[PDB]
Amino acid sequence: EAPAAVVTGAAKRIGRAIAVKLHQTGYRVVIHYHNSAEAAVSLADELNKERSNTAVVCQADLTNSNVLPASCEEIINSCFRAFGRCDVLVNNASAFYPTPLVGKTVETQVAELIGTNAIAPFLLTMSFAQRQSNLSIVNLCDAMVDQPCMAFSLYNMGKHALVGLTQSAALELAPYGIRVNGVAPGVSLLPVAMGEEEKDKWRRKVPLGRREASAEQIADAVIFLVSGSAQYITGSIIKVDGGLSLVHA
Template sequence: MPDTPKIALVTGAAKRIGAEIARHLHAAHFNLVIHYHHSATEALALADELNNLRENSAIALKADLNNQDQLTALAQQASSKWQGIHLLVNNASSFYPTPFDKANGDDWDDLIGSNLKAPYFLAQALAAQLTTAAGSIINIADIYADKPLRNHSIYSIAKAGNLMLTKSLAQELAPRVRVNGIAPGAILWPDGNHKKKEDTLSDEDKEKVLCKIPLQQRGQAQDIAKAILFLVNDAPYVTGQILTVDGGRSLTI
C-alpha cells in the first residue's frame, strides 16, 4: 500500500453507483472528494463513514455542475484540499425519458449539461493537476451511446457525445493523462428521484430487461467500481477506450 494516498474526485458520489465507486477507491487507498448537488445528507454521511475508516481521507463538496462558476469552484476546492488530483470520475448524470414530441429546451440543457458539458469543462479545469500527477479520467458512458434507447433521444445523444469526449480527451491529454470510459448496462434500476418520475420500472418491465441480458441477471454497483479500479491501476497502456460492463446486453440491442 502506498504511503501517500492518491486523490480522487467522484462526481455524483453521494449514493448509488457513485457512492460504491467512492468506497472502492477509498479501500484502494485513495482520498476522496465526494461531489454532490442535492444529496447533502447522503454525501456528508458517506464522508463521515470514510473518515471513520481513515482519518482526514474524505470531504464532501456541493456544486451544480450546470453552473460554470460552481463547477470551476469545485475543481479549485477539490485540488487544493490535498494539493492535487490523481483521478477524476465523471459519474454525475441526469437520466429520464424525453419523448420527441414533448422534449423541451430545459431537458436538452439538463441532459447535455450533466452528461457531456460538465465532464468536458471539469476535465479542462483539472487538466493541469492531472497532468502533474500523471493521472486518469474515467467517464461513465452508457451502452445506449451506440444504439439509442427509445423515448430517451436527448440522453442517448448526450451519452454518444460522452463517448467521443473520452476519445478526444485521450488524444488531447496524452501522454501524461489517460482517459477511458465505462459503459454500464442494467446495474441499478432507476429510482425516480428527480423531476421525471415516469422513469421507474414495473416488475414486468424489469423482467423484460433481464430476459434480454445474456448473463440473465442485473449487474451490481461494485461491478462498475471494480472496472474503474482496473482501468486506473492495472491498465497503464490503455487510453481512449470504453469498457462495456453490461452482462452482454449490448449484444442483443
C-alpha cells in the same frame, strides 16, 4: 502519501460504489453531489471514520449554464484545498429522463441532459488538466448508445458526446501523461421504486446471468482503468453489460 480522486454524483448507487472502492484502495475522495446532501454527508462521515480526513463533500448543479465553468473549476479546486492534489476524475453524475420529439421547458432539458452528461465532464476535464504518477479520467458512458431507449434523444446525445470527449481528451492529454477512459454499463442498479416485474423485463434480456450489474461490478472496471494494470490504456471504453448490447431486437 495517498492519491486523490473526484467522483461526481457519488452520494448514491454506482457513484458511491466507485468512491468507496477508490477509498478502499487508498484514495482520498471528493464526494460531489447535487440533491443527495444527507447520503453524501453520511458517506464522507463513513469514510473519514475508516481513515481520518480522507473524504470531503462538494455540492454543485452540473446543469449547463453561464456559471457551470466556474462550478466545475470549484469542484476540482475543492480536491486541491482538501488533499493538495488531484490524480483521478470520475465523471459519473448524469441526468436521465425521456425527451419525446413529438414540467420542464425543452431548453431546461437540454441544459440538464447535455450539461450533466457531456458539458460538465468537458469543463471538469479542462480544470483537471489545467490544475496539474498515475493521472486518469474515467467517464461513465452507456453500453446502449447505438441502441437507444425510445424517446431518450437528448440523453443519448449527451452520452454520445461523452464518447467523443473521452476520445478527444485521450488524444490531447496523452502528452501530459493523462489517460482518459470510459466504463459503459448496460443495465446496472435499477430504481428501488421501479416494480420488480419491470426490473425483470430488463433482467431477462441480459445473456450473462439474466440479471443487472451491481454498483460494485461497475466500480471494479473503474478501479482497473485507474490502476497500474492500465498504464497503456487510453481512449478505451470498457463495456460492463453482460452481453446486453449484443442482443438483437
